[PDB]
Amino acid sequence: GEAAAAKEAAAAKEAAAAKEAAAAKAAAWKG
Ligand code: NA
Ligand code: NA
């Protein structure tokens, strides 16, 4: 029901968030 659905939301957004960190960091670490 809503329980399943909630877990999709959670997963996706966690994944998304992590990608931004990775990208920003790569850009920075270079200079
Ligand atoms: Na989808
Ligand atoms: Na970013």
Q: How far is it, in rounded angstroms, from Cα 18 to Cα 6?
A: 19
- Ordered DSSP codes for 1-31: -HHHHHHHHHHHHHHHHHHHHHHHHHHHHH-
CA 19 to chain CA mean position, Å: 5
- Tell me how far the alpha carbon of residue 31 lies from the centroid of ligand 2, in angstroms: 15
Find the 10 Cα to ligand 2 centroid distance in Å. 19
Distance 2 CA to ligand 2 centre (A): 31
| CA 29 – CA 3 distance, rounded (Å) | 40
In the reported structure, the alpha carbon of residue 4 is separated from the centroid of ligand 2 by a whole-number distance in angstroms of: 29
Separation between Cα atoms, residue 20 and residue 18, nearest integer Å: 5
Method: X-ray
Report resolution in angstroms. Answer: 2.0
Report angle CA 13, 24, 28 to the nearest 5 degrees: 165
> What DSSP state is assigned to residue 13?
H
Q: How far apart are CA 9 and CA 7, in angstroms?
A: 5
Between CA 10 and CA 16 the distance in angstroms is 10
